């Protein structure tokens, strides 16, 4: 009978290592995210260089894009477990959507702005 105590307490144990797991993963996530924000940047050689540079910003972008969707996959199967927390997730999902599109069409502008150089 004493086991069912051990059981509920194991339920609390499994949820504790659960979000300790969420936290250690998130560490790397933060680093990646930080970098995502970082790569940002608001002559004719220069324009061309910019299109060729923003082209590597995005070669790197899609490069990291595979573990980035690993991140979207992990987050969706993350909030599967677990009121306060939800808004937090939504907040990073919207912030990252805005900077996903934002570096998408900022590199697009840099390509299409040495297009104004070509």
């Amino acid at each position: 009978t004493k086991r069912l105590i051990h059981e509920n307490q194991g339920q609390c144990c499994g949820l504790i290592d659960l979000m300790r797991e969420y936290q250690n993963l998130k560490s790397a996530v933060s680093k990646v995210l930080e970098n995502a924000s970082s790569v940002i940047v608001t002559d004719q050689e220069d324009l061309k260089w910019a299109f060729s540079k923003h082209e590597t910003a995005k070669n790197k972008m899609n490069y990291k894009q595979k573990d980035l969707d690993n991140f979207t996959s992990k987050g969706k199967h993350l909030l599967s477990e677990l009121s306060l927390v939800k808004t937090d997730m939504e907040s990073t999902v919207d912030k990252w959507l805005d900077v996903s599109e934002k570096l998408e069409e900022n590199m697009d502008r840099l390509r299409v702005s040495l297009s104004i150089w070509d």
Binding site: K76, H77, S80, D94, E101, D118
Partner: protein, 321 residues
């Protein structure tokens, strides 16, 4: 003729936020009847599970097999679709069944939210749509059945370039699956919309529309005539000459864009390779020779700056004639 199984429910009433774990982890046992219809049997197990599921919007998926049960015929009558099922039983194990929402109800909730939401709401939904289709391909047939394509077009045609580009990435997700592919082959309005999209000012959107149209013409050849007819209908409805959008890309108002130019030439090439009729062929090539095509081709084949792959596919053009 009774059956003892392992049961679990799946909380999917909201498809834009599906949970991942079925509860409980340790599936409970209860006894059914193999020769009686399942509909009347669903309530005992539904209360057995205490699920927060609209019992009257529910559906059943065989866990390992994935089969969606017809809810009002017995177990013995759909035996031909449960081969792997009775073999698990025959092994003396208990097979597992997933309680979830009908694909119909889920696609219905989706069409509601697409038709009734807007702004940030609508946008979030479209991004997730991609991954949702990757991971349950089974929604795609019910989707085509509920005019979900009507919804997608009816939304995309009054939206901005990001909203439309996201729609198109999602749409490619649909077309990796057979049923969605079949829905696109059926819906002339869709391909018409993609042609309209080839005139977008977003050069990303144009590349994307172009590459999906390539996917469309590469799947089969039976849809080359359907394409050409859709294009004629769009050019005719819009007041522009047929095919004007591609050749406008070809004679570049903005300048050079090798990836789009090569994509376009391969597209028209791969449109050419699928017809034995030389007479409609000649009809069309007159319609093109009218617009000035030969000088554009000639002067571009002159300049040595053209990229080698683009050049190979355009010599495939010339070699055809």
């Amino acid at each position: 003729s009774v059956v003892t199984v392992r049961v679990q429910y799946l909380e999917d009433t909201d498809p834009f936020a599906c949970a991942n774990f079925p509860e409980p982890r340790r599936a409970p046992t209860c006894s059914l009847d193999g020769a009686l219809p399942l509909g009347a049997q669903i309530p005992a197990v539904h209360r057995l599970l205490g699920a927060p599921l609209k019992l009257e919007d529910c559906a059943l998926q065989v866990s390992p097999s994935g089969y969606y049960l017809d809810t009002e015929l017995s177990l013995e009558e759909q035996r031909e679709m449960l081969e792997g099922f009775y073999e698990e039983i025959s092994k003396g194990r208990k097979p597992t069944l997933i309680l979830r929402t009908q694909l119909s109800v889920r696609v219905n909730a989706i069409l509601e939210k697409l038709y009734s939401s807007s702004g940030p709401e609508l946008r979030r939904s479209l991004f997730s749509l991609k991954q949702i289709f990757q991971e349950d391909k089974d929604l795609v047939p019910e989707f085509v059945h509920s005019e979900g394509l009507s919804c997608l077009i009816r939304v995309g045609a009054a939206a901005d370039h990001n909203y439309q580009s996201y729609i198109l990435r999602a749409l490619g997700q649909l077309m990796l699956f057979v049923d969605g592919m079949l829905g696109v082959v059926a819906h002339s309005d869709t391909i018409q919309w993609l042609y309209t999209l080839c005139a977008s000012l977003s050069r990303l959107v144009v590349k994307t529309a172009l590459k999906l149209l390539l996917v469309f013409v590469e799947y089969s050849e039976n849809n080359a005539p359907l394409f050409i007819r859709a294009v004629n209908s769009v050019a005719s409805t819009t007041g522009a000459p047929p095919w004007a959008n591609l050749v406008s890309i070809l004679e570049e108002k903005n300048g050079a864009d090798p990836e789009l130019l090569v994509y376009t030439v391969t597209l028209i090439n791969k449109t050419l390779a699928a017809l034995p009729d030389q007479d409609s062929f000649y009809d069309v090539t007159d319609a093109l020779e009218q617009q000035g095509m030969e000088a554009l081709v000639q002067r571009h084949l002159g300049t040595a700056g053209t990229d080698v792959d683009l050049r190979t596919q355009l010599v495939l053009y010339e070699n055809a004639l």
